[PDB]
């Protein structure tokens, strides 16, 4: 956006943690090339306690399933809007998880850890909890 610095820094922060950037036309590429993974569409925060909230718990969350190589793809600001448009999302920025070329769900959980696990649990293994 006008004067990129906050989101710019934020993106670069998580980027340096080893999360590869994804483009709109490359989302489809990534989807078919990856065995499993999650895509973060980041437009603007709804409020957040702070700003980025600190996504460390997200990394350890996915890692309890080592059988799945979780390719975390983060998108550019203008790309998130385009990717969301192409998929049919509203606007709400969050972690969308995709597996087997299909849609698992979206991680609306952020703060509660025990609940966050349960949410991903329901998305990776459904029927047994899918509270959303």
Question: What domains does the chain contain, in order, with CATH numbers?
Answer: 1-132 (3.40.30.10)
Residue with tokens 């609306």: 108
Report the SS3 class of residue 65: coil
In sequence order, which residues have a C-beta less than 8 Å from that of residue 83 and are 6 or more positions away?
A: 22, 24, 27, 39, 41, 75
Report the SS3 class of residue 48: coil
Return d(Cα 12, Cα 132) in angstroms, integer. Answer: 30
In sequence order, which residues have a C-beta less than 8 Å from that of residue 97 and are 6 or more positions away?
A: 37, 38, 39, 103, 104, 105, 106, 107, 120, 123, 124
Q: Dmax of the chain from CA atoms?
A: 45
Return d(Cα 122, Cα 27) in angstroms, integer. Answer: 24
Distances (CA, A) of 124 to 74, 98, 109, 111: 20, 9, 15, 19
Return d(Cα 89, Cα 86) in angstroms, integer. Answer: 8
Experimental technique, in short, is NMR
Q: Count of CB atoms within 10 A of residue 85's CB?
A: 11
């Amino acid at each position: 956006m006008s004067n990129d610095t906050p989101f710019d820094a934020l993106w670069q922060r998580m980027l340096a943690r080893g999360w590869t950037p994804v483009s709109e036309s490359r989302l489809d590429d990534w989807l078919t090339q990856a065995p499993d993974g999650v895509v973060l569409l980041s437009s603007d925060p709804k409020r957040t306690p702070e700003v980025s909230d600190n996504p460390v718990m997200i990394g350890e969350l996915l890692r309890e399933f080592p059988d799945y190589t979780w390719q975390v793809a983060i998108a550019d600001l203008e790309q998130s809007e385009a990717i969301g448009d192409r998929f049919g999302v509203f606007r709400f920025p969050a972690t969308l998880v995709f597996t087997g070329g299909n849609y698992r769900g979206v991680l609306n959980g952020i703060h509660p850890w025990a609940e966050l696990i349960n949410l991903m649990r329901g998305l990776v293994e459904p029927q047994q909890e899918r509270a959303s």
